[PDB]
Amino acid sequence: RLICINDYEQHAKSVLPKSIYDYYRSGANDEETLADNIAAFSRWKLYPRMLRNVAETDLSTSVLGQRVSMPICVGATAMQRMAHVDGELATVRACQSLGTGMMLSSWATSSIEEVAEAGPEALRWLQLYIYKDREVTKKLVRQAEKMGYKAIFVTVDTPYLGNRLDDVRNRFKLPPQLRMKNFETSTLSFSPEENFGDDSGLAAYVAKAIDPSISWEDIKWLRRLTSLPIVAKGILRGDDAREAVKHGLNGILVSNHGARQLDGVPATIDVLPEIVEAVEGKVEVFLDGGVRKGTDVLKALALGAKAVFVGRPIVWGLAFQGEKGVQDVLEILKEEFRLAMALSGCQNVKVIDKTLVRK
Ligand SMILES: Cc1cc2nc3c(=O)[nH]c(=O)nc-3n(C[C@H](O)[C@H](O)[C@H](O)COP(=O)(O)O)c2cc1C
Ligand SMILES: NC(=O)c1c[nH]c(C2CC2)n1
Ligand SMILES: NC(=O)c1c[nH]c(C2CC2)n1
Numbered sequence: 430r431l432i433c434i435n436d437y438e439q440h441a442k443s444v445l446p447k448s449i450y451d452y453y454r455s456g457a458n459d460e461e462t463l464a465d466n467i468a469a470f471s472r473w474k475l476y477p478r479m480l481r482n483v484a485e486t487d488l489s490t491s492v493l494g495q496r497v498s499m500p501i502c503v504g505a506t507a508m509q510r511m512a513h514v515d516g517e518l519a520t521v522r523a524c525q526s527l528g529t530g531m532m533l534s535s536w537a538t539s540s541i542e543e544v545a546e547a548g549p550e551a552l553r554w555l556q557l558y559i560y561k562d563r564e565v566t567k568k569l570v571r572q573a574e575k576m577g578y579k580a581i582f583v584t585v586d587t588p589y590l591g592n593r594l595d596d597v598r599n600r601f602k603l604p605p606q607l608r609m610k611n612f613e614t615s616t617l618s619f620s621p622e623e624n625f626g627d628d629s630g631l632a633a634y635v636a637k638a639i640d641p642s643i644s645w646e647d648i649k650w651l652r653r654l655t656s657l658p659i660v661a662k663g664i665l666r667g668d669d670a671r672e673a674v675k676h677g678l679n680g681i682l683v684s685n686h687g688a689r690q691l692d693g694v695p696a697t698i699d700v701l702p703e704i705v706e707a708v709e710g711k712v713e714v715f716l717d718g719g720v721r722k723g724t725d726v727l728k729a730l731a732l733g734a735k736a737v738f739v740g741r742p743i744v745w746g747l748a749f750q751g752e753k754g755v756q757d758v759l760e761i762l763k764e765e766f767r768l769a770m771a772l773s774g775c776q777n778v779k780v781i782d783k784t785l786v787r788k
Contacts, residue, residue, distance in 0.1 A: 438454075465688075469698045478775075507534045510539065513750075545577055557581050561639070586665075688718060
């Protein structure tokens, strides 16, 4: 049956309710950036070295000082229990098996503590939104600390939600039995049965809960709040990347939010080199957006990323077979990446160099 990431999406479309598949699939507006996150990878061509001895390929690396089995990690995707009953618990168990890390959404359908209990040995990080209520925000950071999470990925590209047309058409909301489990009030939990207007429920949730005023001053607050490593997630400009470094942050996740926020921004693989150049080696730079194949991972590392994060493929893995489906998606990416390394002449990630790619 399913032998590549595209097969998993096709299967997911066949089993998921339309509103759920559309929520997960969609980009913003006319979905120009959604298409380009994938197309852009195809424009970067590979220049493989031959005869390098690739009998012993070592995919291991490190993310913010923590060892991982491969430079391929799970990105934050909200509300994973829509795809499979075990949701984020399934995901974390698969990451533990693979030896890679899971970035947990602030909008998860499982709590910070539930996920730590399901994956005690898994490398785990918290993706944070800055809520208007700073006490909610602080509690999230404190729970992450207490529960053994190793970094905070602060999302900086979502002062408001992007306009995902299908979610507006479908009047997207959670299924009745589910909630955003990190919160206790009906509104902050995204309770269906609560008034989220007549368009996308999630856009109205964001408008009610998430602070559109945040600024660099709020990054200063967050940097003083926690001594955990903090990564700025959603940076697309070199000037903003230099500002993140100036604020004492510890990495940059080059991201257009899976093309779900501002449509018409560049593909992340295309902006990666500017950002790598701008940070001058001071912090690790990561990528997400459009990673589907081992060669995508290779290209991102050649251009200077430490690791990549995958969003939608993980959700499709859940939709197929929960924990096992996520494990299989990650194993496919791992094997494709191993093969791409070997065929390119790379024994390990340290020798994946800039001469391997040209646009
Ligand atoms: C269904 C879905 C839900 C997401 N939820 C969140 C979220 O809760 N927090 C966040 O910072 N980013 C979220 N993102 C953005 C992802 O972290 C990531 O940037 C993106 O999925 C990467 O692109 P990819 O799906 O092409 O792999 C979401 C993305 C998708 C597709
Ligand atoms: N990729 C497949 O066709 C497939 C079938 N069953 C499974 C389980 C995850 C082990 N994977
Ligand atoms: N924990 C850190 O990596 C870090 C960098 N800069 C600061 C300032 C004291 C706020 N903290």
